[PDB]
Amino acid sequence: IKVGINGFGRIGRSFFRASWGREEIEIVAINDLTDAKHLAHLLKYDSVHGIFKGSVEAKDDSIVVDGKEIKVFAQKDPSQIPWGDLGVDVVIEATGVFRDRENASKHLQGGAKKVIITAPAKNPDITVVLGVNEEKYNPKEHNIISNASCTTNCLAPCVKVLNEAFGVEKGYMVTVHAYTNDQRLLDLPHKDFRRARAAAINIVPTTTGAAKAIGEVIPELKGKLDGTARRVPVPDGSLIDLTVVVNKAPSSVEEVNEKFREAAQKYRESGKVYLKEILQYCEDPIVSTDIVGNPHSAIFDAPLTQVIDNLVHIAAWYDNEWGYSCRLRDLVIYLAER
Amino acid sequence: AIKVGINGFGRIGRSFFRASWGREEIEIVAINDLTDAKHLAHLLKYDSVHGIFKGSVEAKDDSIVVDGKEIKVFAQKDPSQIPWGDLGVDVVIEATGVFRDRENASKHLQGGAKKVIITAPAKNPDITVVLGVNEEKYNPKEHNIISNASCTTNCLAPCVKVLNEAFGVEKGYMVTVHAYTNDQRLLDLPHKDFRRARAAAINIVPTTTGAAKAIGEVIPELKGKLDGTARRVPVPDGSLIDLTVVVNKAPSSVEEVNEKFREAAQKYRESGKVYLKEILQYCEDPIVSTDIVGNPHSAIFDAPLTQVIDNLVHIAAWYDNEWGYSCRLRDLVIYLAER
Numbered sequence A: 001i002k003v004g005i006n007g008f009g010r011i012g013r014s015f016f017r018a019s020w021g022r023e024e025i026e027i028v029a030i031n032d033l034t035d036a037k038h039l040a041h042l043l044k045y046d047s048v049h050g051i052f053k054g055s056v057e058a059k060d061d062s063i064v065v066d067g068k069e070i071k072v073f074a075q076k077d078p079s080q081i082p083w084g085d086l087g088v089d090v091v092i093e094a095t096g097v098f099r100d101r102e103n104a105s106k107h108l109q110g111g112a113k114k115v116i117i118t119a120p121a122k123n124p125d126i127t128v129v130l131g132v133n134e135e136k137y138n139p140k141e142h143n144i145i146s147n148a149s150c151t152t153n154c155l156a157p158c159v160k161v162l163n164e165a166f167g168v169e170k171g172y173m174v175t176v177h178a179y180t181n182d183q184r185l186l187d188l189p190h191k192d193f194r195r196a197r198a199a200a201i202n203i204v205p206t207t208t209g210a211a212k213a214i215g216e217v218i219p220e221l222k223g224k225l226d227g228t229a230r231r232v233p234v235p236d237g238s239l240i241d242l243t244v245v246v247n248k249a250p251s252s253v254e255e256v257n258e259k260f261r262e263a264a265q266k267y268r269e270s271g272k273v274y275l276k277e278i279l280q281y282c283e284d285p286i287v288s289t290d291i292v293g294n295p296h297s298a299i300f301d302a303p304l305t306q307v308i309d310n311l312v313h314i315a316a317w318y319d320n321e322w323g324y325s326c327r328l329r330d331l332v333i334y335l336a337e338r
Numbered sequence B: 001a002i003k004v005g006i007n008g009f010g011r012i013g014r015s016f017f018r019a020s021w022g023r024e025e026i027e028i029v030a031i032n033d034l035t036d037a038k039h040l041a042h043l044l045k046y047d048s049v050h051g052i053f054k055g056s057v058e059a060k061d062d063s064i065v066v067d068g069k070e071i072k073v074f075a076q077k078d079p080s081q082i083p084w085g086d087l088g089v090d091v092v093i094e095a096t097g098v099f100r101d102r103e104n105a106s107k108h109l110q111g112g113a114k115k116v117i118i119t120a121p122a123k124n125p126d127i128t129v130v131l132g133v134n135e136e137k138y139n140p141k142e143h144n145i146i147s148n149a150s151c152t153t154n155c156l157a158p159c160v161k162v163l164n165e166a167f168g169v170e171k172g173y174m175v176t177v178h179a180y181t182n183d184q185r186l187l188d189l190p191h192k193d194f195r196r197a198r199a200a201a202i203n204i205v206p207t208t209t210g211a212a213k214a215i216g217e218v219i220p221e222l223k224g225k226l227d228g229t230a231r232r233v234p235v236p237d238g239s240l241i242d243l244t245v246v247v248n249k250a251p252s253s254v255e256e257v258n259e260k261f262r263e264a265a266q267k268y269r270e271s272g273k274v275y276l277k278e279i280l281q282y283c284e285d286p287i288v289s290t291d292i293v294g295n296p297h298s299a300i301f302d303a304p305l306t307q308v309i310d311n312l313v314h315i316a317a318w319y320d321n322e323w324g325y326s327c328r329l330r331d332l333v334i335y336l337a338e339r
């Protein structure tokens, strides 16, 4: 499948790296707000994920990665991108400013057959989280797809295991999340009064729609969960803390953990390539740097599980950039299959 | 004024010194650590988080002079070797972090001190106190080894007390996003705790806390009702608790929850008790960790972060783990004097 990337940023470039070398995907065009030389350099040297292994060459209006020539554009207006004449099937909308339906749909009016919004969206045709509700996707009816947020891809699978096993009545989630470019280096103007504050020297409370909008991927949990985020000084790597009240009080912490061990095993034996890196059952005492580069949507930290009668608490890690980008890679692959 | 001695002139020991300096109620006369007066004076003068010390600090061979007042300095790793008795010290602040056990902490008493305050949770202390929660349980005649609990307990206890008296806590969980401390490592190094062994300034480090589990020591009825955990993050100071509780009487709205906190804060202030003036602060401005660095309250309630779903209530409160706790130590010393 031909792929176009709009917004070659943290997610865009991680998506490029995640799907490179995979014969199922063929990235043919990239669009951002700079020249080819700057994009090539950003792709080669990453402060968080290391040096790109392939060979990167820059040209006037394109980059050649491992002999493959990829067209580079610098159109701030998405309607000006010729996805159609490039033979692009799917476009990865990762600029962060076109999460609305009318702007995201411009890519279609440009020759794209489908657009994937790398974030929660308002009025998309369908929001999908691999390993949770990807089957509710209908090729002919859905052209604007949201892959939700990094947080949702970690939260949904975990709450799914807890719900099917014990029945979640209500819950709350706090995510200790790495800072991102939607925050500021030093106190600067920003719509959100807190996201405006120096990111690398502050614990920054901010909102997240992961729990509140969980209803989009798991209908029966709608209005059952609330959540929030705490942005902290790590360049990448995040963790979710989920507390739920269940109908079936588990007999112990180990009964809860077993359910996760089994859910992870189930995904791996499904035979679906797009479900192989959804859930990882971990028992080693790790910290954020250990999961940087981990492709799973959720790395369940068994030792952190706690239970008080019908109150259940679990924690799961997720490389907010990498795991999510790998899900984007798997979502593109899934579309190929239909 | 009560004569005070400090054992362990570290983050807490020095912050305690700064917080109680100028206060006529307290008089610090001796300090013990593991280095010379010169190094201590310099550490006191220049702080990476709390700025330059206001008073004038001078170093001598066996002491430091702060604003013209001489303060004997010792370097005895074994607490039994400190002459608190000859110095006339009434209360000793045990802040080395390694003498939390009763038999070790009581060594200060055998040295002449009348009372000891362990700057952390402890096993078998005469009592564990949290100002604004159970200080009235203190008995001047039976309590000589006092635990001031942890920085987290001092934030958690006051907040759950509000929620319990207003709606009744059936059970809950607490997660605290906490600044890193000296019990962690700068770069991956051997440590009893596999995670606290990891580079603190570049990791989100999960670790245990007894704040919730041991809450019963300051609020007996909540014993076994709360559990919690900690997430150490790359911030040199400044922490935040996130508490979720299931209550008996579901609140009508978020505002009703916030109102209880606004009222609890007010009640502390018009209590007239000097030691309860900075227990709780009701805040409505959208702040971040650096905004509470230097804030003396045990808990800075962040009203805008409150959420409610049926009988599930969630609140968040900040606390300068070094400063707030230290001011509580200052207030505790004053409280002891008032008895």
Ligand SMILES: NC(=O)c1ccc[n+]([C@@H]2O[C@H](COP(=O)([O-])OP(=O)(O)OC[C@H]3O[C@@H](n4cnc5c(N)ncnc54)[C@H](O)[C@@H]3O)[C@@H](O)[C@H]2O)c1
Pocket (backbone or CB within 6 Å): A006, A007, A008, A009, A010, A011, A012, A031, A032, A033, A075, A076, A077, A078, A094, A095, A096, A097, A118, A119, A148, A149, A150, A180, A181, A182, A320, A321, A324
């Ligand atoms: N950072 C994460 O971990 C993460 C995880 C999940 C989802 N997301 C979402 O992905 C999106 C992008 O995230 P990001 O972290 O990579 O941010 P980013 O700042 O790195 O932005 C991506 C790129 O978009 C380019 N861009 C901006 N406006 C453009 C325009 N009009 N035309 C073309 N290119 C344009 C920028 O120059 C940049 O290179 C956001 O909606 C974000 O919420 C981010």
Ligand SMILES: NC(=O)c1ccc[n+]([C@@H]2O[C@H](COP(=O)([O-])OP(=O)(O)OC[C@H]3O[C@@H](n4cnc5c(N)ncnc54)[C@H](O)[C@@H]3O)[C@@H](O)[C@H]2O)c1
Pocket (backbone or CB within 6 Å): B007, B008, B009, B010, B011, B012, B013, B032, B033, B034, B076, B077, B078, B079, B095, B096, B097, B098, B119, B120, B149, B150, B151, B181, B182, B321, B322, B325
């Ligand atoms: N950092 C916080 O926010 C915080 C909050 C609440 C309670 N506490 C508790 O206070 C205690 C000290 O904390 P800290 O953060 O200041 O740590 P710290 O390491 O910075 O302070 C310890 C000080 O004790 C001295 N010391 C060590 N062994 C000694 C000995 N045998 N004799 C004399 N001096 C000795 C050291 O030289 C050092 O200056 C700990 O028990 C800690 O858990 C810390």
